[PDB]
Design a protein around this ligand. Structure first.
Ligand SMILES: [Ca+2]
Ligand SMILES: [Ca+2]
Length: 279
């Protein structure tokens, strides 16, 4: 299947070169997979989700996304127009308040919620978790992501937007998950993107157009935007049966666009998420 004039990020993960505007993907499009968007929540009523998104858990007074970050990242995972896996089921876990902040204990609780709740859902193709959040190093935040990963969930986390080494940030520094750095439309490392050896993959992170609260859309930047690309990519490939949750990050790096990014500091992987689709 081919989506013309797709957001540059979708077209980039379906191409070996930058500058295309068509997102090519297998029409299964993540059908049968589930992605938990652990963020500010998801406006599940947005027409772009077509009934495939729903709130499953909040840690605040409402499950409503008052921020828009979670709806944006959910839209990048699998909204109709802005999503990588356009047929996937989106579950929203609101661990961050309407200002975008959250306690580590709340974020650890949300990760442990996904590890259990996936046993009550119907995800025959696999379970994915998109963690578009980051803070300083925390051995407990790292451990919760490792437990999420070990329980059988493809965990994708943002490398962080500090232009620093990601080893000082959690859950980015947890090696068992999929730490995702950010790139722009000219295949440069995003100027904000964290780097380091703990990084596993890069995705489109600068000026990512996706859903927003109020039934709207907007473009924003961050490794928090590159993470749902890889989370949606993992969901998309798990549905195709090419990978599993334990092996998806390793598989995505093996099939990535190698050496195509500039400004990648020495020691940091030069790998761009790539769906490897051949129409
Ligand atoms: Ca290339
Ligand atoms: Ca890793």
């Amino acid at each position: 299947a081919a989506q013309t004039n797709a957001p540059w990020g979708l077209a980039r993960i379906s191409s070996t070169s930058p500058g295309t505007s068509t997102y090519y993907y297998d029409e299964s499009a993540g059908q049968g997979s589930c992605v938990y968007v652990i963020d500010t929540g998801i406006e599940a009523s947005h027409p772009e989700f077509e009934g495939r998104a729903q709130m499953v858990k909040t840690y605040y007074y409402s499950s409503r996304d008052g921020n828009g970050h979670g709806t944006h990242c959910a839209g990048t995972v699998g909204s109709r127009t802005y999503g990588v896996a356009k047929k996937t089921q989106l579950f929203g876990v609101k661990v961050l308040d309407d200002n975008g902040s959250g306690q580590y204990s709340t974020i650890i609780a949300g990760m442990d919620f996904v590890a259990s709740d996936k046993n009550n859902r119907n995800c025959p193709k696999g379970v994915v978790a998109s963690l578009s959040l980051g803070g300083g190093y925390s051995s407990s935040v790292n451990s919760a992501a490792a437990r999420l990963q070990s329980s059988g969930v493809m965990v994708a986390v943002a490398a962080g937007n500090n232009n620093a080494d990601a080893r000082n940030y959690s859950p980015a520094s947890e090696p068992s998950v999929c730490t995702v750095g950010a790139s722009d439309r000219y295949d440069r490392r995003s100027s904000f993107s964290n780097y380091g050896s703990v990084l596993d993959i890069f995705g489109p992170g600068t000026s990512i157009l996706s859903t927003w609260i109020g039934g709207s859309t907007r473009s924003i930047s961050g490794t928090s935007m590159a993470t749902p690309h890889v989370a949606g990519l993992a969901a998309y490939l798990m549905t195709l049966g090419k990978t599993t949750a334990a092996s998806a990050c390793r598989y995505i790096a093996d099939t990535a666009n190698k050496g195509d990014l500039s400004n990648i500091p020495f020691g940091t992987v030069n790998l761009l998420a790539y769906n490897n689709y051949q129409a």
